[PDB]
Ligand SMILES: NC(=O)c1ccc[n+]([C@@H]2O[C@H](COP(=O)([O-])OP(=O)(O)OC[C@H]3O[C@@H](n4cnc5c(N)ncnc54)[C@H](O)[C@@H]3O)[C@@H](O)[C@H]2O)c1
Ligand SMILES: NC(=O)c1ccc[n+]([C@@H]2O[C@H](COP(=O)([O-])OP(=O)(O)OC[C@H]3O[C@@H](n4cnc5c(N)ncnc54)[C@H](O)[C@@H]3O)[C@@H](O)[C@H]2O)c1
Ligand SMILES: CC(C)CC(=O)C(=O)O
């Protein structure tokens with residue numbers, strides 16, 4: 252078949268090329284995202300494959316319907332930037348890749364946890380400043396001696412629980428929709444108990460509106476002194492302001508943030524002004540007990556390979572069997 | 582009983598005090614190390630407890646013998662700075678703490694491994710330089726998808742193997758004196774195969790003279806491109822020069838060094854000149870794919886607590902049962 256791909260990223264290229272060789276299909280990829288203008292390149296292809304945070308507007312589906320392209324598969328999870336109504340209107344079907352690599356994210360959460368437990372940021376700051384003696388004065392903690400609280404026992408949450416348990420840590424979890432049946436690796440506890448007992452709090456919950464600021468001032472007040480919070484999930488989960496105050500007061504020993512609350516706004520400022528123009532960001536970046544990352548928890552060779560291969564397979568599924576396990580409808 | 586402790590470090594104090602309360606024994610501690618002058622403070626105590634890299638000279642044992650103190654227990658592992666002959670001459674007995682916390686070191690090795698697999702140093706360097714976009718261009722790797730080669734299957738090596746296996750990694754190991762019997766978590770392979778197949782090489786071998794530069798030019802030549810080497814063991818294991826060349830040529834993706842080859846020499850320069858005066862150190866410190874630490878792999882609250890409690894228990898063992906599991910005699 253003939254498939255056209257949009258939003259092709261530097262690391263995806265080799266996989267796109269390899270998938271073409273492996274399956275014998277024709278794959279044409281483009282750096283540009285899919286919009287009303289670029290969708291015109293798809294005339295004559297059997298399906299479209301894309302990855303972008305920019306909108307998938309009604310116009311895109313209109314031209315697709317016009318060229319007879321009935322399927323669109325995305326390489327990521329989120330569908331919030333997709334005009335679903337316009338899509339259903341033009342009879343276009345969609346599938347995403349909900350679990351390209353839960354391990355990539357779980358491993359990143361472990362990476363930030365160990366980094367903070369061993370005060371790696373404080374250590375590196377002192378070495379760079381030329382103070383070798385002071386660099387060795389921040390006593391660390393063993394993950395195997397901690398109680399880790401995981402919020403969200405979905406795909407990623409389960410993998411993170413397994414990794415934490417591998418260190419010998421005591422693992423407790425909270426999820427409004429608990430798994431049914433046995434799970435020897437952890438115990439479900441109430442949200443209050445999770446906050447009160449956890450040395451490390453790891454977030455793996457969806458970024459739906461009702462989870463906005465689920466970690467807020469009240470949550471921070473329940474936490475034990477010296478707690479660590481890791482967020483590789485979504486930007487709206489933590490009240491960054493309250494977080495900062497608790498870092499300053501010493502309540503929180505450190506935090507690992509891969510999805511910064513104002514990332515979207517800041518990326519816009521960066522484009523228009525060449526800087527984040529964000530004083531909160533600057534303050535956090537200057538604290539050695541804070542480890543910020545530019546939304547890269549998913550960023551591994553395995554994950555990127557899977558984003559490409561899985562999404563393309565879903566496309567081939569639609570095109571041959573007329574159904575696929577990850578079809579999205581709402 | 583009455584016990585005097587030397588070389589008391591900032592983090593050890595609370596444990597010294599707590600041990601006194603817990604056992605009801607009298608414990609007097611000092612910041613100063615044990616030498617011919619300070620040993621005089623021990624007159625009237627039942628035993629001596631110390632931790633230092635400075636020498637334990639013949640004179641120290643002479644005054645001990647004079648005050649009737651028959652036992653010395655150290656809080657660390659190494660006994661190379663102890664005049665054993667002088668000690669045996671004056672009938673003084675010794676015990677060390679060979680495994681205060683193998684987990685502290687194994688966890689640190691995992692910390693450096695994940696840090697490098699996710700290019701954390703490159704990421705942090707770019708964020709600090711204000712380049713958020715570039716900070717997200719260093720694709721990482723999943724530990725669970727790697728083949729990890731562990732050198733040395735002793736106390737620490739075994740714990741590290743367990744932790745790596747917890748991630749799902751394939752683990753192979755090399756030890757001149759293989760464990761007897763079953764060990765489902767890893768396979769023993771020849772040294773050449775370990776170098777040729779490992780994505781990550783983790784060292785947990787003793788720093789005896791014959792292991793000097795066990796990781797040398799020839800070893801580096803056998804390694805696969807993009808390999809990572811972790812050394813939380815001893816300063817003499819890696820030919821740092823050859824290592825640097827292989828980092829520069831791109832053969833090695835990164836290294837985590839907790840025991841720098843010229844640490845001892847450099848600490849002396851630091852004292853006399855206020856700087857390491859080490860260009861090799863400076864060059865390594867400037868590479869974001871190199872993670873140096875000031876000999877802190879053991880540095881956790883659990884390890885320090887155990888160094889204190891275990892060594893004191895060994896002292897109490899000598900003083901009451903006249904024997905202890907960790908007595909050293911050569
Ligand atoms: N940073 C990145 O690079 C990256 C990449 C992919 C996905 N993510 C995000 O990570 C998060 C977890 O993803 P997943 O695949 O495990 O999701 P999942 O849907 O499989 O699991 C989420 C779980 O959280 C539970 N939940 C909902 N609200 C909760 C709350 N208030 N408290 C506790 N649990 C709650 C749900 O019941 C569900 O079981 C999602 O936000 C996902 O969108 C981040
Ligand atoms: N960085 C730190 O803070 C720190 C702290 C404590 C100990 N250490 C060191 O870490 C190392 C490992 O300690 P341990 O308690 O596991 O030791 P151990 O004696 O229990 O095990 C070492 C093992 O390595 C094996 N061995 C010897 N030479 C080897 C070689 N050439 N190749 C492969 N294996 C070899 C031995 O047969 C032995 O089984 C030691 O050097 C110890 O002194 C470092
Ligand atoms: C943008 C993706 C690459 C990562 C992510 O968080 C997602 O799946 O939406």
Ligand SMILES: CC(C)CC(=O)C(=O)O
Nearest residue numbers: 634656657658659876879
């Ligand atoms: C100096 C100790 C605290 C650490 C160490 O490497 C040792 O046990 O000798």
